[PDB]
RNA sequence: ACUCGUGAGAGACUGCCGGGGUCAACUCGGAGGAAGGUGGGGAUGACGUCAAGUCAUCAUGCCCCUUAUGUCCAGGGCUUCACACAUGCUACAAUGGCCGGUACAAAGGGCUGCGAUGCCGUGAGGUGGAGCGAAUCCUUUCAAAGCCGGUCUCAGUUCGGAUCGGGGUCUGCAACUCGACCCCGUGAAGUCGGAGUCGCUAGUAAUCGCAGAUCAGCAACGCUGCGGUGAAUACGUUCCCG
């Protein structure tokens, strides 16, 4: 059995990828098993000069889906 | 008891009483007490004269304390001063010698605050 | 920053202790992010413009 | 600073990202070549109003989709402009890069294009008030456009004192998340300096 | 010219403009004097506002 | 069998109840080796006390997250849920006791510009 | 002697 | 509190004595959130008092509270643009809070080498009417009496 | 201080300078810019013109000052008092 | 099966009851419910004000330099100190110090990086490389406060750690000016701090630890997050500020 790992920055894209992946492989599938979302957080200062007390927060969220059996540029595929 | 010319405190645990020696802290006291064998939890008023002798000979053998250590430190500082190194003139004018900031702090080397 | 320093940043020397980040688009030496290679101001502006695929505002 | 950029406020709800690719080790160089492509396409084409630039990357292959109101100007009848953009896009270490030149359906409901036109008129000799009036009245004719605000700041009319002016028509609720606000900012180059133009346009709301 | 004083916890600040240092300092002194006069809060300055009759 | 869960500010307790004697098995440790505090034991046994049903149920528990206080609170909530599952009709006595309500008192998120969630940097007007 | 300290330190 | 009074926290009864007052006391002596240490201190003090006197902790604790509980206090009130020290009647909750706070604070300044021993000695003296908290209550009642003339507003 | 494994750090320039200086047993004034170079027992007789920031200060090495660096004996900042 | 992970959905809408209310807004109480009245916290900052800050993120009108105010390099400086102000950390100790045992988190990071077992050092650390692009491996299985036991006995102390002497490790071409850490010794002021002044209404203040960015190394006690234990008080707008 080979692992199909989908990582995507967009949620709906990852559901779409998992869904047509299972559709085309249906082979016995385990289903799009979700994996914990990975969050990267950064805090920056709004003003170019001074004004440190004013901060803005950004994040990048990575959704992970797992396919165990027996594409849009947003989502990757790792086959192992 | 009189140990190397130092009067030990009246009632102290042995290693911490030995800490009162100028050349001994706590780690030194603990390791020397382990080496010679006398108990560490036993008080100063329970010392036998043979115990005083064994600590005396051990300390005089493999340790340097009190006047010799003081004069060696003083000589080292003076020699560091007289060679003209950075730490030399740092010692001469009573300023911190390990790169500490002096804009605001360093009252320890400057002494008590003076006003002008 | 100055053009000369920006160009000098790209040279590979025999000694790597000197390499500075110097964010790519404007050469700002301070506050450079390794993941994007951009300074805080440029990172914020491009994130707001949506040019970074995944970065967005925070709320929690 | 008072109002944040509307596109970034609704980036995760209404609007979509202008670059679409995934990268973990190669995020930095992808960003580098992305901004290089953007600046190259901005400097190369200025006659036809460039509405938008998307970049998609899958391994070697890059798809750059560029929107303009005059596709014929930026494209070659024999492919001369296409050949030029292709050659200058290979040189950006884009490996195999292919371009999709596209045309906007309505070139007056686009905030960026409206700001483009307002700046172009304001640059040479046109009084600013005429520019905002014409832009606003032309925007209202479009069916889906339901609100518009146009604001310019700087040394308007070559004066010694900076000023800010703004004209609104309809509804522009910048605080409402579901309502989409097309936002366009552009700097007009006058002999007395730089004049900033911002345009917000409201065309219904999405849920 | 800007001046800030901490009169027993009360912050009194003033700011003036002038063509030179001397004029600015003099105007700042006058402004600070007026502010301190309005700040007094001692009895002589708070006796006409206390309810009477 | 019957199984329930209790949650208290990042502490999770999975509880299994049987009609055995009053023996507590918290991840293989008793009510003494685990939770060595009388107040925590009161907090645990309060639903049993108000329901009169002490020393007639053997409890097994899986604990994860939080500290002793949060774990004790989650365990009490889980015990209350197990009791209401076993016997419904005593819901008033438990509900008026408040043991059936989850406590949404979580750690408030830290904010930028402040040392803590609400503590502000010292400001000198001079 | 300092020189001896150099020799023992580095050699 | 500009828009009205705030709700009160219903603190729970104690496990080993079953009274509200001891829980209030442990909350008063609490420091840095070390509730276990505060409970240990209070329980040890109660046991020490029990061993010394031979009776139940709670009754002598209540006697000490009633001995150090105030009924009249003095507050600075501004009427007609002028401030006076007006004697004011104390609500029962405030009296209990003040008595417990005085007990804890004065026991913290004793010289009995340990918090448990200091607290036990202070509570015993307050029960017998010799504690410094009793003196503080006497002084505050005296100050309330001395300014009775300002009681009309 | 520098680790013992790496050995003392002496710059090559003044190194070859002092080997060519001591090969004929004559000690002329050697002018150098490398303050970071330590002092080797091969410098015992030589006198260095160590850079300061404005000029070069002459420093005559002795047996006592071995193991230090040249920059110790070229004070940079000049402070006389207020 | 129970958690958990992440998709969809339900669930709070004064929905219902009683009473005030112009039978109006709205308000008080009650039932139900996990949650009751914008549930808790965020993102979001109207017209404008202060010619607020930024020609040193960037761009830019005008003026100026142009064998230099451009550009390359070595060394030094930004770290200087008779003082003043501000923000923090550690303390002045027994609600504690030291030693031994022992139980519970969340979040985050990792490829020329995380780096384990083992071995060598007292200890920084050295050798070595298992496994990991990671719900898997490593950050130890993760913590400290906490609980149990022993000791110290109110002292400038077994408190406090500054300063200084000596000896080392790591990074870096290079730790003198000017890194951090480790070991031995040294053991200052400091006895809860005048006038005055600051923060905080509940998982809050207080206190304890963990992680990340920047980063070869660090001046980090700073900043941004995460959780552990967790209080007191609010009678009421007369006075102070907005």
mmCIF file of N, CA, C and O (backbone and C1' of nucleotides) in Angstrom, chain H residues 1-2 5-6 8-9 11 24 27-37 40-41 75 78 91 97 108 111 113-115 118, chain J residues 94-96 145-148 153-155 201-202 205-208 228-242:
data_model
loop_
_atom_site.group_PDB
_atom_site.id
_atom_site.type_symbol
_atom_site.label_atom_id
_atom_site.label_comp_id
_atom_site.label_asym_id
_atom_site.label_seq_id
_atom_site.Cartn_x
_atom_site.Cartn_y
_atom_site.Cartn_z
ATOM 1 N N UNK H 1 -18.429 50.110 38.289
ATOM 2 C CA UNK H 1 -19.604 50.174 39.163
ATOM 3 C C UNK H 1 -20.420 51.439 38.939
ATOM 4 O O UNK H 1 -21.288 51.767 39.746
ATOM 5 N N UNK H 2 -20.134 52.147 37.845
ATOM 6 C CA UNK H 2 -20.911 53.334 37.510
ATOM 7 C C UNK H 2 -22.335 52.978 37.106
ATOM 8 O O UNK H 2 -23.253 53.782 37.303
ATOM 9 N N UNK H 5 -24.268 47.841 40.999
ATOM 10 C CA UNK H 5 -23.443 46.880 41.739
ATOM 11 C C UNK H 5 -23.114 45.654 40.904
ATOM 12 O O UNK H 5 -23.862 45.259 40.008
ATOM 13 N N UNK H 6 -21.960 45.041 41.222
ATOM 14 C CA UNK H 6 -21.430 43.867 40.549
ATOM 15 C C UNK H 6 -21.765 42.599 41.328
ATOM 16 O O UNK H 6 -21.868 42.628 42.558
ATOM 17 N N UNK H 8 -21.463 38.974 43.223
ATOM 18 C CA UNK H 8 -20.501 38.427 44.165
ATOM 19 C C UNK H 8 -20.179 36.979 43.819
ATOM 20 O O UNK H 8 -21.029 36.234 43.324
ATOM 21 N N UNK H 9 -18.937 36.588 44.086
ATOM 22 C CA UNK H 9 -18.492 35.228 43.807
ATOM 23 C C UNK H 9 -18.887 34.304 44.953
ATOM 24 O O UNK H 9 -18.472 34.537 46.094
ATOM 25 N N UNK H 11 -18.101 31.672 46.994
ATOM 26 C CA UNK H 11 -17.042 30.746 47.370
ATOM 27 C C UNK H 11 -17.613 29.557 48.139
ATOM 28 O O UNK H 11 -18.615 29.667 48.850
ATOM 29 N N UNK H 24 -12.804 31.654 53.381
ATOM 30 C CA UNK H 24 -12.491 33.071 53.229
ATOM 31 C C UNK H 24 -11.102 33.381 53.774
ATOM 32 O O UNK H 24 -10.350 34.163 53.181
ATOM 33 N N UNK H 27 -8.457 32.149 51.378
ATOM 34 C CA UNK H 27 -8.384 33.069 50.251
ATOM 35 C C UNK H 27 -7.670 34.360 50.631
ATOM 36 O O UNK H 27 -6.959 34.940 49.803
ATOM 37 N N UNK H 28 -7.847 34.823 51.869
ATOM 38 C CA UNK H 28 -7.163 36.035 52.306
ATOM 39 C C UNK H 28 -5.659 35.817 52.424
ATOM 40 O O UNK H 28 -4.869 36.655 51.976
ATOM 41 N N UNK H 29 -5.241 34.697 53.025
ATOM 42 C CA UNK H 29 -3.814 34.409 53.177
ATOM 43 C C UNK H 29 -3.176 33.898 51.898
ATOM 44 O O UNK H 29 -1.962 33.657 51.880
ATOM 45 N N UNK H 30 -3.950 33.728 50.832
ATOM 46 C CA UNK H 30 -3.415 33.209 49.581
ATOM 47 C C UNK H 30 -2.434 34.195 48.959
ATOM 48 O O UNK H 30 -2.671 35.406 48.941
ATOM 49 N N UNK H 31 -1.323 33.668 48.446
ATOM 50 C CA UNK H 31 -0.311 34.477 47.780
ATOM 51 C C UNK H 31 0.159 33.762 46.525
ATOM 52 O O UNK H 31 0.462 32.566 46.567
ATOM 53 N N UNK H 32 0.216 34.497 45.414
ATOM 54 C CA UNK H 32 0.740 34.009 44.140
ATOM 55 C C UNK H 32 0.005 32.772 43.634
ATOM 56 O O UNK H 32 0.544 32.018 42.818
ATOM 57 N N UNK H 33 -1.217 32.540 44.099
ATOM 58 C CA UNK H 33 -1.980 31.395 43.656
ATOM 59 C C UNK H 33 -1.608 30.082 44.305
ATOM 60 O O UNK H 33 -2.176 29.047 43.932
ATOM 61 N N UNK H 34 -0.682 30.082 45.263
ATOM 62 C CA UNK H 34 -0.280 28.860 45.957
ATOM 63 C C UNK H 34 -1.372 28.501 46.959
ATOM 64 O O UNK H 34 -1.250 28.706 48.169
ATOM 65 N N UNK H 35 -2.470 27.955 46.433
ATOM 66 C CA UNK H 35 -3.609 27.636 47.286
ATOM 67 C C UNK H 35 -3.298 26.474 48.219
ATOM 68 O O UNK H 35 -3.762 26.453 49.364
ATOM 69 N N UNK H 36 -2.520 25.497 47.749
ATOM 70 C CA UNK H 36 -2.172 24.363 48.597
ATOM 71 C C UNK H 36 -1.381 24.811 49.818
ATOM 72 O O UNK H 36 -1.648 24.363 50.940
ATOM 73 N N UNK H 37 -0.410 25.702 49.621
ATOM 74 C CA UNK H 37 0.394 26.182 50.739
ATOM 75 C C UNK H 37 -0.445 26.998 51.714
ATOM 76 O O UNK H 37 -0.281 26.880 52.934
ATOM 77 N N UNK H 40 -2.509 24.592 53.707
ATOM 78 C CA UNK H 40 -1.656 23.952 54.703
ATOM 79 C C UNK H 40 -1.415 24.873 55.887
ATOM 80 O O UNK H 40 -1.502 24.447 57.044
ATOM 81 N N UNK H 41 -1.123 26.147 55.616
ATOM 82 C CA UNK H 41 -0.857 27.100 56.690
ATOM 83 C C UNK H 41 -2.081 27.250 57.583
ATOM 84 O O UNK H 41 -1.985 27.195 58.815
ATOM 85 N N UNK H 75 -14.724 57.565 57.036
ATOM 86 C CA UNK H 75 -14.452 57.758 55.620
ATOM 87 C C UNK H 75 -14.373 59.242 55.298
ATOM 88 O O UNK H 75 -15.033 60.068 55.933
ATOM 89 N N UNK H 78 -16.811 64.430 50.978
ATOM 90 C CA UNK H 78 -16.744 65.812 50.517
ATOM 91 C C UNK H 78 -18.164 66.335 50.335
ATOM 92 O O UNK H 78 -18.892 65.877 49.448
ATOM 93 N N UNK H 91 -21.318 47.627 56.995
ATOM 94 C CA UNK H 91 -22.136 46.468 56.681
ATOM 95 C C UNK H 91 -21.467 45.198 57.208
ATOM 96 O O UNK H 91 -20.243 45.147 57.346
ATOM 97 N N UNK H 97 -14.828 41.099 56.343
ATOM 98 C CA UNK H 97 -13.660 41.221 55.477
ATOM 99 C C UNK H 97 -12.543 41.990 56.170
ATOM 100 O O UNK H 97 -11.377 41.583 56.133
ATOM 101 N N UNK H 108 1.102 38.518 60.052
ATOM 102 C CA UNK H 108 2.292 38.520 59.211
ATOM 103 C C UNK H 108 3.448 39.305 59.821
ATOM 104 O O UNK H 108 4.595 39.104 59.411
ATOM 105 N N UNK H 111 6.474 37.655 65.509
ATOM 106 C CA UNK H 111 7.850 37.184 65.626
ATOM 107 C C UNK H 111 7.891 35.751 66.133
ATOM 108 O O UNK H 111 8.677 35.410 67.021
ATOM 109 N N UNK H 113 8.475 33.063 64.122
ATOM 110 C CA UNK H 113 9.416 32.268 63.338
ATOM 111 C C UNK H 113 8.752 31.458 62.229
ATOM 112 O O UNK H 113 9.444 30.864 61.397
ATOM 113 N N UNK H 114 7.422 31.429 62.190
ATOM 114 C CA UNK H 114 6.724 30.666 61.163
ATOM 115 C C UNK H 114 5.322 31.231 60.995
ATOM 116 O O UNK H 114 4.706 31.687 61.960
ATOM 117 N N UNK H 115 4.822 31.179 59.757
ATOM 118 C CA UNK H 115 3.480 31.678 59.474
ATOM 119 C C UNK H 115 2.426 30.933 60.278
ATOM 120 O O UNK H 115 1.480 31.544 60.788
ATOM 121 N N UNK H 118 2.688 32.072 63.955
ATOM 122 C CA UNK H 118 2.242 33.457 64.074
ATOM 123 C C UNK H 118 0.727 33.557 63.957
ATOM 124 O O UNK H 118 0.081 34.254 64.748
ATOM 125 P P A J 94 10.523 35.758 56.017
ATOM 126 O "O5'" A J 94 10.741 34.193 55.814
ATOM 127 C "C5'" A J 94 9.965 33.463 54.870
ATOM 128 C "C4'" A J 94 9.709 32.048 55.324
ATOM 129 C "C3'" A J 94 9.042 31.913 56.692
ATOM 130 O "O3'" A J 94 8.166 30.787 56.680
ATOM 131 C "C1'" A J 94 11.115 30.786 56.711
ATOM 132 P P U J 95 6.576 31.008 56.690
ATOM 133 O "O5'" U J 95 6.176 31.005 55.149
ATOM 134 C "C5'" U J 95 6.306 29.824 54.366
ATOM 135 C "C4'" U J 95 5.666 29.973 53.007
ATOM 136 C "C3'" U J 95 6.387 30.909 52.036
ATOM 137 O "O3'" U J 95 6.230 30.417 50.705
ATOM 138 C "C1'" U J 95 4.183 31.666 52.358
ATOM 139 P P G J 96 7.291 29.382 50.084
ATOM 140 O "O5'" G J 96 8.703 29.952 50.545
ATOM 141 C "C5'" G J 96 9.280 31.082 49.909
ATOM 142 C "C4'" G J 96 10.710 31.267 50.340
ATOM 143 C "C3'" G J 96 11.680 30.193 49.875
ATOM 144 O "O3'" G J 96 12.151 30.424 48.561
ATOM 145 C "C1'" G J 96 11.976 30.579 52.187
ATOM 146 P P A J 145 9.816 23.286 40.927
ATOM 147 O "O5'" A J 145 8.539 24.178 41.260
ATOM 148 C "C5'" A J 145 8.671 25.573 41.484
ATOM 149 C "C4'" A J 145 7.340 26.278 41.436
ATOM 150 C "C3'" A J 145 6.279 25.784 42.401
ATOM 151 O "O3'" A J 145 6.457 26.248 43.726
ATOM 152 C "C1'" A J 145 5.319 26.054 40.273
ATOM 153 P P G J 146 6.423 25.210 44.952
ATOM 154 O "O5'" G J 146 5.262 24.184 44.572
ATOM 155 C "C5'" G J 146 3.897 24.571 44.629
ATOM 156 C "C4'" G J 146 2.978 23.461 44.183
ATOM 157 C "C3'" G J 146 2.948 22.228 45.068
ATOM 158 O "O3'" G J 146 2.135 22.404 46.213
ATOM 159 C "C1'" G J 146 3.092 21.571 42.799
ATOM 160 P P C J 147 2.739 22.168 47.682
ATOM 161 O "O5'" C J 147 2.665 20.589 47.870
ATOM 162 C "C5'" C J 147 1.435 19.897 47.723
ATOM 163 C "C4'" C J 147 1.651 18.407 47.654
ATOM 164 C "C3'" C J 147 2.626 17.838 48.671
ATOM 165 O "O3'" C J 147 2.044 17.635 49.946
ATOM 166 C "C1'" C J 147 3.150 16.990 46.534
ATOM 167 P P C J 148 2.926 17.844 51.272
ATOM 168 O "O5'" C J 148 3.859 16.555 51.316
ATOM 169 C "C5'" C J 148 3.300 15.251 51.363
ATOM 170 C "C4'" C J 148 4.370 14.190 51.312
ATOM 171 C "C3'" C J 148 5.553 14.404 52.240
ATOM 172 O "O3'" C J 148 5.288 14.011 53.573
ATOM 173 C "C1'" C J 148 6.337 13.819 50.093
ATOM 174 P P U J 153 20.662 25.981 62.334
ATOM 175 O "O5'" U J 153 19.789 27.180 62.909
ATOM 176 C "C5'" U J 153 19.960 28.507 62.426
ATOM 177 C "C4'" U J 153 18.680 29.299 62.528
ATOM 178 C "C3'" U J 153 18.158 29.513 63.947
ATOM 179 O "O3'" U J 153 17.509 30.780 64.025
ATOM 180 C "C1'" U J 153 16.547 28.336 62.684
ATOM 181 P P C J 154 17.804 31.758 65.264
ATOM 182 O "O5'" C J 154 17.472 33.207 64.694
ATOM 183 C "C5'" C J 154 18.425 33.920 63.915
ATOM 184 C "C4'" C J 154 17.764 34.895 62.971
ATOM 185 C "C3'" C J 154 16.743 35.839 63.605
ATOM 186 O "O3'" C J 154 16.788 37.096 62.933
ATOM 187 C "C1'" C J 154 15.699 34.570 61.913
ATOM 188 P P A J 155 17.652 38.306 63.538
ATOM 189 O "O5'" A J 155 19.128 38.022 63.017
ATOM 190 C "C5'" A J 155 20.175 37.709 63.929
ATOM 191 C "C4'" A J 155 21.476 37.425 63.217
ATOM 192 C "C3'" A J 155 21.781 38.328 62.023
ATOM 193 O "O3'" A J 155 23.172 38.633 61.982
ATOM 194 C "C1'" A J 155 21.733 36.060 61.326
ATOM 195 P P U J 201 -9.563 45.205 34.057
ATOM 196 O "O5'" U J 201 -10.473 44.581 35.204
ATOM 197 C "C5'" U J 201 -10.273 43.237 35.626
ATOM 198 C "C4'" U J 201 -11.527 42.621 36.197
ATOM 199 C "C3'" U J 201 -12.807 42.839 35.389
ATOM 200 O "O3'" U J 201 -13.602 41.656 35.440
ATOM 201 C "C1'" U J 201 -13.109 43.637 37.593
ATOM 202 P P A J 202 -14.208 41.026 34.091
ATOM 203 O "O5'" A J 202 -13.234 39.810 33.752
ATOM 204 C "C5'" A J 202 -12.285 39.350 34.707
ATOM 205 C "C4'" A J 202 -12.137 37.849 34.691
ATOM 206 C "C3'" A J 202 -13.447 37.069 34.697
ATOM 207 O "O3'" A J 202 -13.245 35.810 34.056
ATOM 208 C "C1'" A J 202 -12.256 36.605 36.677
ATOM 209 P P A J 205 -3.925 39.410 33.686
ATOM 210 O "O5'" A J 205 -3.623 39.969 35.146
ATOM 211 C "C5'" A J 205 -3.642 41.364 35.411
ATOM 212 C "C4'" A J 205 -3.555 41.646 36.890
ATOM 213 C "C3'" A J 205 -2.311 41.128 37.594
ATOM 214 O "O3'" A J 205 -1.202 41.996 37.449
ATOM 215 C "C1'" A J 205 -4.226 40.546 38.847
ATOM 216 P P A J 206 0.279 41.399 37.276
ATOM 217 O "O5'" A J 206 0.438 40.387 38.492
ATOM 218 C "C5'" A J 206 0.729 40.855 39.800
ATOM 219 C "C4'" A J 206 0.827 39.714 40.777
ATOM 220 C "C3'" A J 206 1.863 38.653 40.447
ATOM 221 O "O3'" A J 206 3.164 39.013 40.877
ATOM 222 C "C1'" A J 206 -0.189 37.610 40.965
ATOM 223 P P U J 207 4.428 38.788 39.915
ATOM 224 O "O5'" U J 207 4.715 37.226 40.020
ATOM 225 C "C5'" U J 207 5.033 36.629 41.268
ATOM 226 C "C4'" U J 207 4.733 35.152 41.263
ATOM 227 C "C3'" U J 207 5.426 34.333 40.187
ATOM 228 O "O3'" U J 207 6.765 34.006 40.512
ATOM 229 C "C1'" U J 207 3.141 33.765 40.245
ATOM 230 P P C J 208 7.836 33.752 39.342
ATOM 231 O "O5'" C J 208 7.451 32.317 38.772
ATOM 232 C "C5'" C J 208 7.657 31.146 39.546
ATOM 233 C "C4'" C J 208 7.328 29.900 38.765
ATOM 234 C "C3'" C J 208 7.949 29.800 37.382
ATOM 235 O "O3'" C J 208 9.291 29.351 37.413
ATOM 236 C "C1'" C J 208 5.658 29.246 37.256
ATOM 237 P P G J 228 -3.971 25.005 31.386
ATOM 238 O "O5'" G J 228 -2.804 24.946 32.466
ATOM 239 C "C5'" G J 228 -2.078 23.746 32.678
ATOM 240 C "C4'" G J 228 -1.350 23.768 33.996
ATOM 241 C "C3'" G J 228 -2.102 24.388 35.161
ATOM 242 O "O3'" G J 228 -3.029 23.499 35.751
ATOM 243 C "C1'" G J 228 0.105 25.222 35.110
ATOM 244 P P U J 229 -4.386 24.060 36.398
ATOM 245 O "O5'" U J 229 -3.909 24.766 37.742
ATOM 246 C "C5'" U J 229 -3.215 24.038 38.743
ATOM 247 C "C4'" U J 229 -2.681 24.954 39.813
ATOM 248 C "C3'" U J 229 -3.688 25.919 40.413
ATOM 249 O "O3'" U J 229 -4.482 25.313 41.415
ATOM 250 C "C1'" U J 229 -1.701 27.082 39.879
ATOM 251 P P G J 230 -5.925 25.916 41.765
ATOM 252 O "O5'" G J 230 -5.594 27.322 42.426
ATOM 253 C "C5'" G J 230 -6.570 28.347 42.461
ATOM 254 C "C4'" G J 230 -5.951 29.709 42.293
ATOM 255 C "C3'" G J 230 -6.900 30.799 41.832
ATOM 256 O "O3'" G J 230 -7.678 31.335 42.887
ATOM 257 C "C1'" G J 230 -4.954 30.866 40.515
ATOM 258 P P A J 231 -9.148 30.755 43.172
ATOM 259 O "O5'" A J 231 -9.850 31.902 44.020
ATOM 260 C "C5'" A J 231 -9.688 33.263 43.662
ATOM 261 C "C4'" A J 231 -8.755 33.969 44.610
ATOM 262 C "C3'" A J 231 -9.302 35.232 45.254
ATOM 263 O "O3'" A J 231 -10.102 34.954 46.388
ATOM 264 C "C1'" A J 231 -7.141 35.656 44.399
ATOM 265 P P A J 232 -11.536 35.653 46.558
ATOM 266 O "O5'" A J 232 -11.184 37.116 47.074
ATOM 267 C "C5'" A J 232 -10.451 37.309 48.274
ATOM 268 C "C4'" A J 232 -10.076 38.756 48.442
ATOM 269 C "C3'" A J 232 -11.212 39.746 48.235
ATOM 270 O "O3'" A J 232 -11.986 39.932 49.406
ATOM 271 C "C1'" A J 232 -9.352 40.414 46.950
ATOM 272 P P U J 233 -13.577 40.116 49.303
ATOM 273 O "O5'" U J 233 -13.753 41.550 48.639
ATOM 274 C "C5'" U J 233 -13.230 42.711 49.265
ATOM 275 C "C4'" U J 233 -13.159 43.868 48.303
ATOM 276 C "C3'" U J 233 -14.467 44.252 47.638
ATOM 277 O "O3'" U J 233 -15.291 45.052 48.463
ATOM 278 C "C1'" U J 233 -12.772 44.120 46.006
ATOM 279 P P A J 234 -16.884 44.865 48.426
ATOM 280 O "O5'" A J 234 -17.349 45.845 47.262
ATOM 281 C "C5'" A J 234 -17.050 47.231 47.326
ATOM 282 C "C4'" A J 234 -17.178 47.892 45.977
ATOM 283 C "C3'" A J 234 -18.465 47.627 45.218
ATOM 284 O "O3'" A J 234 -19.546 48.421 45.673
ATOM 285 C "C1'" A J 234 -16.628 47.386 43.759
ATOM 286 P P C J 235 -20.972 48.346 44.938
ATOM 287 O "O5'" C J 235 -21.994 48.894 46.027
ATOM 288 C "C5'" C J 235 -22.213 48.194 47.241
ATOM 289 C "C4'" C J 235 -22.296 49.141 48.412
ATOM 290 C "C3'" C J 235 -22.922 50.496 48.125
ATOM 291 O "O3'" C J 235 -24.337 50.460 48.127
ATOM 292 C "C1'" C J 235 -20.926 50.791 49.357
ATOM 293 P P G J 236 -25.159 51.050 46.880
ATOM 294 O "O5'" G J 236 -24.566 52.515 46.692
ATOM 295 C "C5'" G J 236 -24.692 53.199 45.455
ATOM 296 C "C4'" G J 236 -23.776 54.394 45.397
ATOM 297 C "C3'" G J 236 -23.622 55.056 44.038
ATOM 298 O "O3'" G J 236 -24.691 55.940 43.747
ATOM 299 C "C1'" G J 236 -21.498 54.804 45.066
ATOM 300 P P U J 237 -24.666 56.847 42.421
ATOM 301 O "O5'" U J 237 -23.885 58.162 42.864
ATOM 302 C "C5'" U J 237 -23.780 59.273 41.982
ATOM 303 C "C4'" U J 237 -22.468 59.998 42.144
ATOM 304 C "C3'" U J 237 -22.065 60.867 40.955
ATOM 305 O "O3'" U J 237 -21.317 61.987 41.420
ATOM 306 C "C1'" U J 237 -20.430 59.208 41.301
ATOM 307 P P U J 238 -22.056 63.365 41.789
ATOM 308 O "O5'" U J 238 -21.510 63.705 43.245
ATOM 309 C "C5'" U J 238 -21.654 65.005 43.792
ATOM 310 C "C4'" U J 238 -20.440 65.398 44.593
ATOM 311 C "C3'" U J 238 -19.119 65.407 43.841
ATOM 312 O "O3'" U J 238 -18.927 66.583 43.075
ATOM 313 C "C1'" U J 238 -18.845 64.290 45.905
ATOM 314 P P C J 239 -18.063 66.538 41.723
ATOM 315 O "O5'" C J 239 -16.554 66.491 42.230
ATOM 316 C "C5'" C J 239 -16.041 67.497 43.090
ATOM 317 C "C4'" C J 239 -14.756 67.058 43.740
ATOM 318 C "C3'" C J 239 -13.630 66.690 42.788
ATOM 319 O "O3'" C J 239 -12.924 67.824 42.321
ATOM 320 C "C1'" C J 239 -13.849 65.009 44.433
ATOM 321 P P C J 240 -12.645 68.006 40.753
ATOM 322 O "O5'" C J 240 -11.431 67.018 40.469
ATOM 323 C "C5'" C J 240 -10.171 67.211 41.091
ATOM 324 C "C4'" C J 240 -9.147 66.257 40.538
ATOM 325 C "C3'" C J 240 -9.212 66.041 39.035
ATOM 326 O "O3'" C J 240 -8.534 67.052 38.315
ATOM 327 C "C1'" C J 240 -9.084 63.948 40.131
ATOM 328 P P C J 241 -9.097 67.549 36.897
ATOM 329 O "O5'" C J 241 -8.706 66.373 35.901
ATOM 330 C "C5'" C J 241 -7.351 66.001 35.713
ATOM 331 C "C4'" C J 241 -7.232 64.794 34.822
ATOM 332 C "C3'" C J 241 -8.033 64.845 33.533
ATOM 333 O "O3'" C J 241 -7.406 65.608 32.519
ATOM 334 C "C1'" C J 241 -8.368 62.758 34.576
ATOM 335 P P G J 242 -8.298 66.510 31.535
ATOM 336 O "O5'" G J 242 -8.952 65.452 30.542
ATOM 337 C "C5'" G J 242 -8.135 64.668 29.686
ATOM 338 C "C4'" G J 242 -8.922 63.578 29.006
ATOM 339 C "C3'" G J 242 -10.225 63.995 28.349
ATOM 340 O "O3'" G J 242 -10.049 64.627 27.096
ATOM 341 C "C1'" G J 242 -10.577 62.028 29.592
#
